[PDB]
């Protein structure tokens, strides 16, 4: 037999690459392309692939892009250096809100003004002074760390969905195997150009506004026997939650410099009220009993205890939640107060704390200040999942947890993998001299299909964001040219099928013509002879396509 | 661009003249297109160079798949549709400029390309060379 060169071979390799950031065509948006994701999903019949949501670079890539766009939005905003002064505070007489006085900087640098603003106790750090009941002195939290930046008017906290799209030459494989646990084989896969839109919703403990499971509740973890891993629970039903801050604050504007202002909380309209969340009781209870049972399947002969918060540090103990730019730290200890034993009105009130100083993304010194928001601050959302951490007592104790934002994205991106298409390949023949739809079928069947299908590959012919696009285009060109070049030197113009003068080595494969062509798919073949790739290429370029020209044409002198 | 012929298989100076006259001129003139082969300012230049490369390669690629190396004139096996244009050989070649023609048959661009790449330049290879096994 003889080596035949094929172009358009439906095989791929796992590969990492920068994906395009696509936005909403109807539209932190200037960086992304507002196009149609065109989710022309194709199912690959009879194809099984290995997915691993814990090693998915799309998650890491998203983490970086979410942070980067978020940071750009604060770039032109005011650094509140003038507020890192002694604050004289008194109790508001209109127990978490204090009335503080400052000597602020005026438009003129040689003048100061005495101004006041209201603050939440959580954002204020006492100096070496005690509560006297009338007055005491304070520092703003983080004045010993960073010049915290005020969010600008029109900074958007709208979790506008992001779509990731493959560069030409790459494809995104989606796992449709309902109940797939995030690792191992998926026996139902399909390919897309783009992912569904993912809303970069930021939270801890309770995952909000995501995609619900198609089947039953699925519990996923990198390692279920590792008590240091986060367990992601995907609900198949949403639970209604609505949060509100019913205390009518007024926004004041204080000049703190030559062309800049600070937005201060003040003039509380009459009543003092605690912020809270409204959670349906029957749905919460049903949800945990159902989660309990699924956990029991993973942890049999154990009592399940969804009974404890983290321990007391607000940053990790409460539910980090955003509402229209407002920041809530809600106490969920009343939700996670139950057990499960497999063989044994009507709402829930969650009190919430409000804080204006935000250590976003767990970074230190990258501080944002949230200005007060006037009006009806109420947000209604869907709990779609849980982040649980498993803790001797023949009991599996669980606590809600989080803070690693990657888990909020693994929870959506677990369905996707990125691979690189590798159109060249070889196989023996007896003759001497929608792209991946032909996958899961034998090489023979594909070779017929590819006489047409191979041409679908021809469809592939802001600061750092400008660079990401340039690298993407340059790489696409580079790979294209390398393949064109190899085909050129091998004498394979008319590349879909190219017979050559290189003989087949039984040492590469000793399978018969029909054993190979009718009992293997192209990927199986690629693996079986994969380490002879360089050998074959040398035989084709250094010998046969040189000898076949020199011994025929130079003789024509 | 394309136009019907009877045969089965300074760049813009030839403008304002008929297609016929230009087709003679272009046997030479077409080659003048071959002459085309700081922060944000660095980016503007890179985008410009990358685009020039991209457009070049797309045209080279189309000509390759249509079997049109020696590209200045390339006859094909795709028949002319009277539905694209029902003008006669001389009515077209001697009474139109290339831009007028481009407008008259402009929406058939994708049709013609498909006929050339998916059918005629596939069929013309498979039915002649695979038989040589």
């Amino acid at each position: 037999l003889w080596v035949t060169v094929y172009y358009g071979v439906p095989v791929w390799k796992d590969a990492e690459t920068t994906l395009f950031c696509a936005s909403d065509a109807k539209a932190a948006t200037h960086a992304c392309v507002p196009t149609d994701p065109n989710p022309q999903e194709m199912v690959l019949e009879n194809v099984t692939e290995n997915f691993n949501m814990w090693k998915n670079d799309m998650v890491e890539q998203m983490h970086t892009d979410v942070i980067s766009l978020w940071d750009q939005s604060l770039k032109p905003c005011v650094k509140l250096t003038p507020l890192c002064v002694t604050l004289e505070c008194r109790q508001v007489n209109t127990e978490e809100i204090k009335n503080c006085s400052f000597n602020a900087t005026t438009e003129l640098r040689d003048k100061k003004q005495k101004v006041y603003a209201l603050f939440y106790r959580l954002d204020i750090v006492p100096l070496e002074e005690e509560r006297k009941g009338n007055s005491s002195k304070y520092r703003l939290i983080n004045c010993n760390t960073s010049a915290c930046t005020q969010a600008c008017p029109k900074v958007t906290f709208d979790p506008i969905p992001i779509h990731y799209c493959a560069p030409a030459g790459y494809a995104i494989l989606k796992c449709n195997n309902k109940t797939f646990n995030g690792t191992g084989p998926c026996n139902n896969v399909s390919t897309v150009q783009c992912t569904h839109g993912i809303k970069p919703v930021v939270s801890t403990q309770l995952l909000l506004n995501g995609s619900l499971a198609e089947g039953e509740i699925i519990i996923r973890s990198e390692n279920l026997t590792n008590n240091v891993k986060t367990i992601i629970v995907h609900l198949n039903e949403s639970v209604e939650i609505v949060c509100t801050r019913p205390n009518n604050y007024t926004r004041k504007s204080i000049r703190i410099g030559p062309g800049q202002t600070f937005y201060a909380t003040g003039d509380i309209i009459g009543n003092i009220r605690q912020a809270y969340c409204n959670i349906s009781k029957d749905d919460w209870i049903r949800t945990l009993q159902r989660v309990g049972k699924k956990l029991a399947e993973h942890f049999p002969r154990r009592i399940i205890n969804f009974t404890s918060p983290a321990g007391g540090d607000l940053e990790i103990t409460t539910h980090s939640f955003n509402c229209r730019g407002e920041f809530f730290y809600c106490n969920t200890s009343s939700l996670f107060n139950s057990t499960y034993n497999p063989n044994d009105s009507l709402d829930i009130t969650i009190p919430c704390r409000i804080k204006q100083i935000i250590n976003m993304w767990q970074r230190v010194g990258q501080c944002m200040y949230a200005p007060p928001i006037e009006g009806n601050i109420t947000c209604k959302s869907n709990i779609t999942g849980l982040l649980l951490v498993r803790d001797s007592n023949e009991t599996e104790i669980f606590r809600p947890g989080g803070g690693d934002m990657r888990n909020n994205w693994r929870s959506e991106l677990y369905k996707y993998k990125v691979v690189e298409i590798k159109p060249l390949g070889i196989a023996p023949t007896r003759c001497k001299r929608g792209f991946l739809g032909a996958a899961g079928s034998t090489m023979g069947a594909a070779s017929i299909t590819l006489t047409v299908q191979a041409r679908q590959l021809l469809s592939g012919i802001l600061g750092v964001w400008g660079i990401k696009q340039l690298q993407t285009r340059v790489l696409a060109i580079e790979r294209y040219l390398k393949d064109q070049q190899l085909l050129g030197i091998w004498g394979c113009s008319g590349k879909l099928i190219c017979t050559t003068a290189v003989p087949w080595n039984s040492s590469w494969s000793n399978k018969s013509h029909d054993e190979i062509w009718g009992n293997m798919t192209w990927m199986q073949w690629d693996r079986e002879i994969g380490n002879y790739t360089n050998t074959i290429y040398r035989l084709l370029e250094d010998s046969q396509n040189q000898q076949e020209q020199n011994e025929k044409d130079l003789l024509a002198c | 661009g394309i136009a019907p012929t009877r045969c089965k298989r300074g760049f813009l100076g030839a403008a304002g003249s008929t297609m016929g006259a230009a087709s003679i001129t272009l046997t030479v003139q077409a080659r003048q297109l071959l002459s085309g082969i700081l922060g944000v300012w660095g980016i503007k230049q890179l985008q410009t160079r990358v685009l020039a490369i991209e457009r070049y390669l797309k045209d080279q690629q189309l000509l390759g798949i249509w079997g049109c190396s020696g590209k200045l004139i390339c006859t094909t096996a795709v028949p002319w549709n009277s539905s694209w244009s029902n003008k006669s050989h001389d009515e077209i070649w001697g009474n139109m400029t290339w831009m007028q023609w481009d407008r008259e048959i402009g929406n058939y661009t994708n049709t013609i390309y498909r006929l050339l790449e998916d059918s005629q330049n596939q069929q013309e290879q498979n039915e002649k060379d695979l038989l040589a096994c």
Partner: antibody, heavy 126, light 109 residues
Framework: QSLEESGGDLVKPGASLTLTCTAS?????????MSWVRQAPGKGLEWIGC????????TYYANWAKGRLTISKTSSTAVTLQMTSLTAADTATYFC????????????????????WGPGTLVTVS | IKMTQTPSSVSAAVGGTVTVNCRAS??????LAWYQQKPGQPPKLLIY???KLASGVPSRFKGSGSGTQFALTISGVQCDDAATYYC???????????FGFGGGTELVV
């Protein structure tokens, strides 16, 4: 393993037809070419076409029935022979069969096996 | 495809031999097959690739050929089956569908 076949009846001339061939005791997999033929009195089997299990390719002799013949995969165990206008159906009977080919690696394949056959049926008109 | 056959019918003494000739116009590189069709039945495959005996088929059915001329020889012949013997061929490609089957020969011995 055997093939069952049904759906033929007497229909108006020029009427459509959907015959179903069923994989009794099996499903169709790699290299299973599920084909149809026409058996006229005094003749052999004229080729209609076939489909490839594991893919969506459907190959048929359009030179006989372009615009008249569609061969469609349904279940993993069945194929439907779809006709848009019947004439010759009143002469030749239809049979479904499970066959296989050898691939050349040059973009095509040749017939080898037709091991399972359905009982067949005549579909006439009037 | 373009193919012919000869004869239209055959006969033999019982226990003797029968020859059926498949005469393609087209040059075929050993890709044809022989079938036996008993009345009321789909044809049964007898021979693969012009000469390989199919499983379940007796040694009585043998044959060979090349190019355009192929033949089935039946030896130690009985016509208990009262079958018509046929020649089959066909090739799949994306540009052309090359298929056919002969009229076959009816055998009585």
């Amino acid at each position: 393993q055997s093939l069952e076949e049904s759906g033929g009846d007497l229909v108006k001339p020029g009427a459509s037809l959907t015959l179903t061939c069923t994989a009794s005791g099996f499903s169709f997999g790699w290299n299973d070419y599920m084909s149809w033929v026409r058996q006229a009195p005094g003749k052999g089997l004229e080729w209609i076409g076939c489909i490839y299990a594991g893919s969506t390719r459907s190959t048929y002799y359009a030179n006989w029935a372009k615009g008249r013949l569609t061969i469609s995969k349904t279940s993993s165990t069945a194929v439907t022979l779809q006709m848009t206008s019947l004439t010759a159906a009143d002469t030749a009977t239809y049979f479904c069969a499970r066959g296989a080919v050898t691939y050349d690696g040059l973009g095509g394949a040749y017939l080898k096996h037709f091991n399972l056959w359905g009982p067949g049926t005549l579909v006439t008109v009037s | 495809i373009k193919m012919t056959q000869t004869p239209s019918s055959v006969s033999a003494a019982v226990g003797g031999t029968v020859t059926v000739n498949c005469r393609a116009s087209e040059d075929i590189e050993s890709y044809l097959a022989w079938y036996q069709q008993k009345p009321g039945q789909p044809p049964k495959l007898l021979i693969y690739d012009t000469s390989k005996l199919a499983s379940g088929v007796p040694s009585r059915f043998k044959g060979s050929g090349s190019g355009t001329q192929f033949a089935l020889t039946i030896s130690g012949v009985q016509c208990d089956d009262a079958a018509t013997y046929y020649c089959l061929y066909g090739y799949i490609s994306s540009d052309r569908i090359d298929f056919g089957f002969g009229g076959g020969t009816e055998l009585v011995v």
